[PDB]
Amino acid sequence: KDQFIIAYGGLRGAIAFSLGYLLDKK
């Protein structure tokens, strides 16, 4: 159950990608 939270609820790659989405494409 935790391995699921620390995967998103905790990490939230949704943000890391957004920030890493720029320097990645731009």
UniProtKB/Swiss-Prot annotation:
Record's comment describing the protein's domains: The C-terminal intracellular domain is subject to extensive post-translational modifications and binding partner interactions which regulate transporter activity, scaffolding functions, downstream events and localization.
Location in or out of the cell: Cell membrane; Basolateral cell membrane
Family per similarity comment: Belongs to the monovalent cation:proton antiporter 1 (CPA1) transporter (TC 2.A.36) family.
Role, per record: Electroneutral Na(+) /H(+) antiporter that extrudes Na(+) in exchange for external protons driven by the inward sodium ion chemical gradient, protecting cells from acidification that occurs from metabolism. Exchanges intracellular H(+) ions for extracellular Na(+) in 1:1 stoichiometry. Plays a key role in maintening intracellular pH neutral and cell volume, and thus is important for cell growth, proliferation, migration and survival. In addition, can transport lithium Li(+) and also functions as a Na(+)/Li(+) antiporter.
Ranges annotated as spanning the membrane: 1-23
Subunit and interaction comment: Homodimer; dimerization is crucial for its function. Oligomer. Interacts with CALM1 in a calcium-dependent manner. Interacts with TESC. Interacts (via the C-terminal domain) with CHP1; the interaction occurs at the plasma membrane in a calcium-dependent manner and facilitates the maturation, cell surface expression, and function of SLC9A3. Interacts with CHP2; the interaction occurs in a calcium-dependent manner. Interacts with EZR; regulates the cytoskeletal interactions of SLC9A1 and promotes stress fiber formation.
Modification after translation, per record: O-glycosylated. Ubiquitinated, leading to its degradation by the proteasome. Ubiquitination is reduced by CHP1.
Tissue note: Kidney and intestine.
Reported disease: Lichtenstein-Knorr syndrome: An autosomal recessive neurologic disorder characterized by progressive cerebellar ataxia and severe progressive sensorineural hearing loss.
Protein known as: Sodium/hydrogen exchanger 1
Higher taxonomy: Eukaryota, Metazoa, Chordata, Craniata, Vertebrata
Further remarks about this protein from its record: Predicted models used for more than 20 years predicted 10-12 transmembrane segments. More recently, the structure of SLC9A1 has been solved and reveals that SLC9A1 possesses 13 transmembrane regions.
